[PDB]
Every structure is written in C-alpha cells, then in structure tokens.
Amino acid sequence: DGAPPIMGSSVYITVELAIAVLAILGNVLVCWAVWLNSNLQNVTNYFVVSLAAADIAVGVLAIPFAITISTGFCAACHGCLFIACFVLVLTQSSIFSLLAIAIDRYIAIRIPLRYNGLVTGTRAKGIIAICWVLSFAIGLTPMLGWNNCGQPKEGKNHSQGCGEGQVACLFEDVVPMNYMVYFNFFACVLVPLLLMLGVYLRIFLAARRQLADLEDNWETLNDNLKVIEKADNAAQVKDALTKMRAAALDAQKMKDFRHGFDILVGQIDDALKLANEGKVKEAQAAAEQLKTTRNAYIQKYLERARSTLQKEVHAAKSLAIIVGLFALCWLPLHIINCFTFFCPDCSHAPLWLMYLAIVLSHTNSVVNPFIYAYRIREFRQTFRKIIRSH
C-alpha cells in the first residue's frame, strides 16, 4: 500500500542538512571577510552582511523548522504557524536587502558627488533595523489572524491522535493559499522584484548615457581643432573656439585634473582674444598648443572616467545576477502555489515536486558567496587570505 514514508523522508532530511552546512560555512566566510578587510567596509557591503545573516539563519533555524513541519507532528496551531512562517521573515529580509543594494548603486551612478553625504553608515544601520522589524511583521502576518487554525481538518487531526487545541502540523493546512499567492507572492515578492528590475535598467541607461557624453565631448574637442587648422576667416576660428570652451567647462563638472582643465580653458581664452583682434595665424598657432594639454591631461582624465564607469557596470551586472538567482530559486515554489489556488479542477502537484521546490529555494542561501568569489576581486582575495592562514 505505497512505499514507506521514512524512505523518501530520509532523502529529504539528508539533502536539507547538506544545504544547511553549506549555507552556514559560506555566509560565515562573507561576514568574516567584511569584518577583517577595510576595503569591503562600505555601505553597499553592510546590506550584503544583512543578506548573509538571513542566509546563516536559513541553515541554523529555517531548515530544522522545514524538517519538523514535514513530519506532520501534533502541535498547538500558533506554534505550528511560527515553524511554517519563520522562513518568510528571512525571505522578506532578503528582498529588502537586495532592493537597498540596487538603490545604493543607482545613487552612486546618478549623483556620485553627493553619495558620501547622503548614503552614510549610521543611516544604513537604521534602514537595516527598520527592514528586519518589517520582515517580522510581513512574514508572521498569519499569526495575527490570517490562518486556518479556526477551521481545522478534524479527520486528519483525530487520525494523527492530536489533543485539544492541537493540529497535524502541515504547511497547507495552517497557512492560507490566498495569503501565500496575493500577499506574500504578488505584493511582497513580485512587486519589489519588478522594482529592482526597473532600478537596474536605470543604472545601465545612466552609465551608457554618461559614457556616450564623455566620447561626445572628446570628439567635439578634436573635430573643432581640425576646423581651426582648415579655417581661412576670423569668424570660423571664433565659432570653433566658443564651442570648444563650452565643452571644456561642461567636462570640468584629483587637483591635477582640475588644474589641467584650467590651463585648457586659459589657452582657449588666449586664442579667442587673438581671433577677436583679427589675428588669424596667431590664433591658429595658439590653438595648436591645446594638443599638448590634450595628450598630457585631457586624455588621462577621459581614460580614468571611462574605467570607473566600466567598473560600475561590471559591479551592477554581478549584483543583478544575485537578484536573478533569487528569482530562479523562489519562483517554482511560488508558481506551484498559484496552481493550487487558481486551478481547483487541476490535480495537486506531486509530493516529490513540492519538496524539490522547497530544496531549490533553500539552495539560494548557498549561491551568493560563490558569485562574490567569482565576480568580485576584493572578496576573492580576502577569501583566499582567510582559508590559507586559518
């Protein structure tokens, strides 16, 4: 009469324990790397530490809770709710952490000269504390009354041998599907994910527009120099230098680059004064000495600004993979709940698929340290130093 339940149960428990060990070790290493390396002690990494803490808690608490809830043991319904809903608190803390990293990177690309004064460590710690408080409120909403404890499965409870106030502790019997689909999936997971997608698109658009603008100014400085060399009128040299001066002051918006631009503006003002006095050849020769400033200062500034923007793109690509990996690990479990709720004429997904979807969502607490080690050089080197010594 069907295979013994302990056979498939033993497979699930061994696999979950294997995930718990890898979720603890890997994320402990992340926290430790940020702790000892001062180069990783930025506001961006305080949210990654919060994300690493939620993943440590998955291995220490959410997985032992998941193994417990699969037995269907008799328990007080509110206690059963805490066992089933605690993982939702950790998941909600993870989406807030991911959303804060995305906004932080958008502030760093849109207003870098205002980033340090706006995004401070003390303000970051305050955001994390408020977000952990809200994660508890959202994740434990069934404990406030939105649960099936009021309407228990009397048949399954008497067969299990449960006493007064006790229920056969099974997730789908205590947590309502309308909460899981509408409140937890649609409003608390899907809406913030779509927002993160929007924010990352705005980061890639800003970097592209800014890079195109740097090349536009560089071309304007070169093609206008060619116009002066080919000029035969006092107006032609004046019109080319006026457009050159506007590009020089726009690109101006360490002290070596600030000084380098002041000599360039100074040389343009020298040639423009000669152009207004009618001296065509003296203005052309004065505009030729701009080539010396271009090679010694302007080319070095353009190259430095380009590398910083390329570094920001590569960094935003790495953190976007993290958001994609969270979606890939949590969407199957969310999509099966949609089928259970919206399709009552459809057969319930098989038990093996349910526990495969639960296992896949838990492997997300193992992947992040690998992405840091493969995509972020600063994390990779700190990991190597910790492992080699200790």
Ligand SMILES: CC(C)CCC[C@@H](C)[C@H]1CC[C@H]2[C@@H]3CC=C4C[C@@H](O)CC[C@]4(C)[C@H]3CC[C@]12C
């Ligand atoms: C954060 C650290 C200290 C761990 C917290 C302790 C955990 C393991 C405790 C706190 C509250 C506890 C639950 C409280 C109520 C019940 C109802 C009872 O009929 C069965 C056990 C059960 C379901 C408990 C299981 C263990 C539990 C979840």
Ligand SMILES: CC(C)CCC[C@@H](C)[C@H]1CC[C@H]2[C@@H]3CC=C4C[C@@H](O)CC[C@]4(C)[C@H]3CC[C@]12C
């Ligand atoms: C990886 C993510 C992004 C893609 C989503 C793929 C998964 C979740 C989807 C695609 C096909 C789906 C299955 C198609 C058919 C059925 C039969 C129905 O009676 C119950 C649900 C069930 C068993 C579906 C469960 C969810 C399912 C396995």
Ligand SMILES: CC(C)CCC[C@@H](C)[C@H]1CC[C@H]2[C@@H]3CC=C4C[C@@H](O)CC[C@]4(C)[C@H]3CC[C@]12C
């Ligand atoms: C990645 C995000 C933006 C897209 C995911 C949209 C989700 C919510 C979609 C994708 C496929 C959809 C399902 C496709 C099939 C069915 C069978 C139907 O009888 C009831 C609705 C139901 C169960 C759909 C519910 C919503 C669903 C799970």
Ligand SMILES: Nc1nc(NCCc2ccc(O)cc2)nc2nc(-c3ccco3)nn12
């Ligand atoms: N639907 C569901 N079920 C379970 N576990 C119970 C699996 C099950 C379902 C039906 C059954 O007859 C016996 C066992 N955990 C679950 N976790 C989640 C979840 C967490 C976050 C998003 O979805 N949904 N979810």
